[PDB]
Amino acid sequence: MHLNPAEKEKLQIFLASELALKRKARGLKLNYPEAVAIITSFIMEGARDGKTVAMLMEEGKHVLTRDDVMEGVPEMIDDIQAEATFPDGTKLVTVHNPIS
Amino acid sequence: MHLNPAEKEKLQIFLASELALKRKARGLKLNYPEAVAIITSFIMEGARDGKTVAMLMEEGKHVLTRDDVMEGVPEMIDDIQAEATFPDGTKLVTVHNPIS
Amino acid sequence: MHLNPAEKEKLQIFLASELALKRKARGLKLNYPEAVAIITSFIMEGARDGKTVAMLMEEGKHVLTRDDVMEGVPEMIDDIQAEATFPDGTKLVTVHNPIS
Amino acid sequence: MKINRQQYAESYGPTVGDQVRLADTDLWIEVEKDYTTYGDEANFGGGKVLREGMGENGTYTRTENVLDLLLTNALILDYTGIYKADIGVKDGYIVGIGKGGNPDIMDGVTPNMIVGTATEVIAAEGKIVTAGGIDTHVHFINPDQVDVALANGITTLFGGGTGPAEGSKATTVTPGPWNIEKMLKSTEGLPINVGILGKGHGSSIAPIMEQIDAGAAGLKIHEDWGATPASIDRSLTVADEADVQVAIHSDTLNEAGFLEDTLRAINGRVIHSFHVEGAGGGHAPDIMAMAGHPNVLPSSTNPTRPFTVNTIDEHLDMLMVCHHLKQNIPEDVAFADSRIRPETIAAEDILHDLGIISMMSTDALAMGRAGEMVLRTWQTADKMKKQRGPLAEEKNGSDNFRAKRYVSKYTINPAIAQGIAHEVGSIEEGKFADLVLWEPKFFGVKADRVIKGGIIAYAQIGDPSASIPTPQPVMGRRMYGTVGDLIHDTNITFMSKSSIQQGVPAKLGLKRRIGTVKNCRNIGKKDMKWNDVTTDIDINPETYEVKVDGEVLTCEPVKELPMAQRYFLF
Amino acid sequence: MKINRQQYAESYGPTVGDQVRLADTDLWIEVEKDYTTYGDEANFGGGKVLREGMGENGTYTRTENVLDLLLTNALILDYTGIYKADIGVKDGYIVGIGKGGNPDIMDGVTPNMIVGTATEVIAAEGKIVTAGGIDTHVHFINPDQVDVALANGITTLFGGGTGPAEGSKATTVTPGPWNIEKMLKSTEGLPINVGILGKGHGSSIAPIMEQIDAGAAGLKIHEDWGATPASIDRSLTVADEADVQVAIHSDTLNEAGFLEDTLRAINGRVIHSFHVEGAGGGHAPDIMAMAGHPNVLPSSTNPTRPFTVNTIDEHLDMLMVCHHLKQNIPEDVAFADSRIRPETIAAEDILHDLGIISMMSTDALAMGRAGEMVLRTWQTADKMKKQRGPLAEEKNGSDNFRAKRYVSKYTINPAIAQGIAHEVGSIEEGKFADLVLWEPKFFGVKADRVIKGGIIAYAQIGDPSASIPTPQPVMGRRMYGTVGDLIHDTNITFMSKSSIQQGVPAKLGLKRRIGTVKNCRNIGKKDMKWNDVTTDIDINPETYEVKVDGEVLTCEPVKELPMAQRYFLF
Amino acid sequence: NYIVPGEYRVAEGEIEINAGREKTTIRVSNTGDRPIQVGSHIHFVEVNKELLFDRAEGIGRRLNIPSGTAARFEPGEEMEVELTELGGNREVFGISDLTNGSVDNKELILQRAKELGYKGVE
Ligand code: NI
Ligand code: NI
Ligand code: NI
Ligand code: NI
């Protein structure tokens, strides 16, 4: 596979997102790291899909809403940042105030 | 996400449980680490769900039965212990003789 | 669980394969590490199922075809090798030219 | 020109009279004073103030009043106060708390806090800064426990052990000169301050004392090695000669005596009573009465902190594993059960709130959680505010008195108890620069950056391949202070005066900073900051009811805590 | 008062006459003798025996017959016996095997096994304790291979390599003075004992000998560097002068000679024949005949161990990668195919069972598995019991003779072969305290705790954040023996006498314990414990059939092994 | 046929502890209000002062119970226990500092016990 350090690390984010999605599916309000993991994995999968940075900057605001998360979580998350390999190489996506 | 060392480690348990559950679903009798992973992940998800320690001490005895596992596995597992964040903080669950 | 170093590492391969399978399921042509992960995890799960080394040497050539992967990926993968615990202990499976 | 307060606080952190919520608790801390000069605040970045000829002085060499490091705009939470200041570090020590910058052009610059060519900057605006936690009940069982501790803001580990040997899995003991030497050498690779306790057991002086001369920083008396009148007596005789502290885990079984017999053996000498409530060990049921005495420095371990609905149910199996007991031996189970009591655990919450138990500690990996000393301190304070109300001593609707009482339990008080407060345990000028930055939303839960001897040792930081350090995954990671030989200069091995005089560091090739243990024998409960209360504690032998000043101390367990499921992935 | 046997064994481990199953095999070991005094068994914990004035002596200083460490109630499995004893360790060495405690009050205490103030305790009741494995066929290819080895109970790595360079990926060789110096320096950070082999190739003495003087502990003759009569001869001349061992991988191709030519070049001198069956290399098809000769110390590598239904199919591609061969070169494939033979692999099982092959080894990362030497030894023994029956020498229905024969293959025999058995390779008084604890259910599969020089270096242990060390995830982890400078005192670098005399350790700044290689040239097959059989081995050049004493040695491959899918996650 | 990995097959018979040593049965009362538990290897005369028994009969002896076990006395509880003789050099040091030498010095041990208020000395 020739995994580099970031590829190994970022597997963790996907895993944490899968965990969090299972928790959401059984009806739990998500906590801070769960919410961050879901939105982060969404961004990295979006890059893999070939979306643009600009698309993901706006989609990232609609992945989770306040009723999906515990009290105070929306206000704890000022932004989420992730880098992934787009068709045009690695780029940074910053999603400001992802959960209103 | 602000993952601490235990949060990183415990992702592995969830992953191993998912692996083991796929193996069970395709009809395999589970081995020692598979059985331990499934019961352990069950406990940690139970804590996340807001069950009590006492509930999990008894539920943990009914997750897998001897027909789910290979010969000798029930006798290899004297107990399974796991710590997770309950609504009232980290607590230890010990399940004695989880597979009869 | 008593995980040894290889058991910990090889969890990663399963995880990467799950990631890659999700990407395939949503219609993406797979890349080099994705293709390797899928075929590798297939081999290790096959060993767990109790297949022989010889069976997996030939099945490994039929897991992914060239239309499943990006241009050039078939030619990038000369072989895939994996070791797993068969019913008769650890063995090495080598799949030559897994994607024609 | 005037700045409204919301905008001021957003830019520079809070100032006088502003309050900040601690994590998701209902505890509020209020800024008591601010050392700045409004308009001359230090800050660093593109077009900011700390630039040559401006807020950075371009004239002075490093020796001329210039800092190695300035933490700008810190909200300090410490036994000494809750207040706003810049913190100046030099030669690995805190040298100034006040106002940093350039006397060329700024008013009110503390004279030894010049930002010069030699000065690094850490922005602490919007952060709470505390001293590093001092954990004095550490079992050295698994090296992976160090990062666990760092992640919750602990910077000093005092205790004992040789790894996962049964003696160490039960007791904070590194026994004898050889094991002590081996663990001093191991310590060279641990990125945290360390002091090692010898076995406080024997009936002759020499076998105990030779541990001190070998490099131990103290002793542990533990019932699993025989917490007899003789072992107690000899250990305290050694400690009084050597000027080191003794920790005690007393005779739960009451085999050779009851509590009063242990106190008679102590004979008014100074001692640190571990897990004073007693689930973690001690004369059943009444050990917690130790915490009323003037010669006792009392600490709790953390799994009883605070009293919750699940607390009791986890303890029996925990205890049986730690102390190598067998479920099929009825007296083993009876011994274990005798240590677990809701009555004393409930009272322990209140005794903390009253300043009668002076310290917190972990009991890492031997009935305690390496990364939850700080966490559970604040959960306890929060529960007590909910159940008891604001303390009478509070003003302005703030919880500053309670916050000072509680922060002292895991910073200054353990340092004083151990004879190391000249080096560590508080944010004061002249002390080692072990500092923890916290985002208020994560306060007491997950540390932002842990500074050890003036260099960052541990941080919550993201993708090392990214364009900036903030992208995911953000996790706790060891920083440059832990790498190469820098691990030697950023950490202290605390040792007895005798071992230092006898040249043990040179003999073993120790390269770490060497700290001297001293002034351990001339202190008492009166010296525990904000937690100095002596009183008669009565524990009913039939009902386990705890009384102080004729009043039963009890409270309810809670079903939920803050600093819990909002934060943790597992 | 009497205790029934089931309850006795549950509390203290088994005693005389009791049997224990090895993992999930059908091998049973029986306790032959027990050094205890019934009623005075040592044990540690709350209210237990090893307490001051009781089972722990409170009088004696560390020098006065007191131990640094007592392993209580060990079931020892060793070439010297299968028996029950306490094991006493001091200064990193095994100093007593017998009965530990306090002569004040206990009967039958071994005089130098006093539990005192200085003594740590490891509870070995219910554990099997063996010597650390001695792997003498290690390719140093990937540092991650060390933990793999530790996890299966290996504590000494002898071999060569500089990392994943093709020379090292094929051969156990660290070539020349500079590469040897570099790898001796690397070794300072490897938490395992090490000895390094130079290149056993040349036609002049000086280029070979200068490797020995540089710090090599032996030589490797390998066909990939030319296993010619000259290289064989010069290497053995060097070895005879230097008192180090030579390992040989002979000329598979029969290019410069057949087996008889290699034996003539050896000329009766001592040599260690690697992978003597020959899949791993050597004169095709008859190399295994080496194992009949009195001057040959024969080892197997592990992928042929034991003969299973999948064994052949994995080998061709494995061999081609290791030896840098090309699938499109017909003679490369012919060479590879010539080394792989069910006839010799089947006979190799039997030759092990008969004591004709004396040693096991890995061939780590170059046609062998770093963490499966111990594993595959016991799988082989189990297969042989199933197919051949209990050995004639057995009694009481136990498999003690077979167990001693097989444990010797990876402990004492490789140590003797290498000239290091004065330090390592068995549980005997005066040897280095490299000890492996095993739960019987995991015996030979996953080690519980690996002790190196008297300190735990590796352990299967759980959550470092937990209240106790047993909660999940339980995995193999490096312990305090590997941290800081303690890695120097808990491990041995084995070196030639000449390099030691010439001050190589000081020249390179080596801080590890330095072990001397000696008494390598004055031994033979007769010195291989429980595996000392010499005989004429005939290998049919047409059919590859192996004969000993006129009988064809053959057996069937098995479809399943114990110590396999019950245990492993992958 | 069923395989329990690592299982024991213990031999027949029973293990006699403290074989060949004199045994003595005595009555002991916990006169205190908190429980007292006594381990197998503590010099019996040196136990908690509030245990009432004939102290002389505890000299040079310990409980005749399996190594690592204990006898538990609840508050007010009187029970009969069996003692065995100490072995080895028959010396005791430390613990309650009643002996610090040979257990043969009965008079000295009892004098110290009486002076310090250990219940049950003549
Ligand atoms: Ni304790
Ligand atoms: Ni403790
Ligand atoms: Ni070879
Ligand atoms: Ni090799």
Swiss-Prot record, chains D, E:
Location within or outside the cell: Cytoplasm
Annotated gene: ureC
Pathway in which the depicted protein is active: Nitrogen metabolism; urea degradation; CO(2) and NH(3) from urea (urease route): step 1/1
Residues that coordinate or bind Ni(2+) 2: K220, H249, H275
Active site feature: H323
Domain of life: Bacteria
Annotated keywords: Cytoplasm, Hydrolase, Metal-binding, Nickel
Modified residues annotated as N6-carboxylysine in this record: K220
Presence of the UniProt keyword Cytoplasm in the record: yes
Enzyme Commission number(s): 3.5.1.5
Subunit description: Heterotrimer of UreA (gamma), UreB (beta) and UreC (alpha) subunits. Three heterotrimers associate to form the active enzyme.
Annotated protein name in UniProt: Urease subunit alpha
UniProtKB/Swiss-Prot annotation, chain F:
Pathway: Nitrogen metabolism; urea degradation; CO(2) and NH(3) from urea (urease route): step 1/1
Domain of life assignment: Bacteria
One Gene Ontology term of the molecular function aspect: urease activity
EC assignment: 3.5.1.5
CDD domains cross-referenced by the UniProt entry: Urease_beta
Gene3D superfamilies named among the record's database cross-references: Urease, beta subunit (2.10.150.10)
Keywords: Cytoplasm, Hydrolase
Localization (cell): Cytoplasm
Chief place where the protein resides: cytoplasm
GO cellular component, one term: urease complex
Quaternary context: Heterotrimer of UreA (gamma), UreB (beta) and UreC (alpha) subunits. Three heterotrimers associate to form the active enzyme.
Family assignment from sequence similarity: Belongs to the urease beta subunit family.
NCBIfam families referenced in this protein's UniProt entry, alphabetically: PRK13203.1, urease_beta
Protein name: Urease subunit beta
Organism, as annotated: Sporosarcina pasteurii
Native organism taxonomy: Bacteria, Bacillati, Bacillota, Bacilli, Bacillales
Annotated gene: ureB
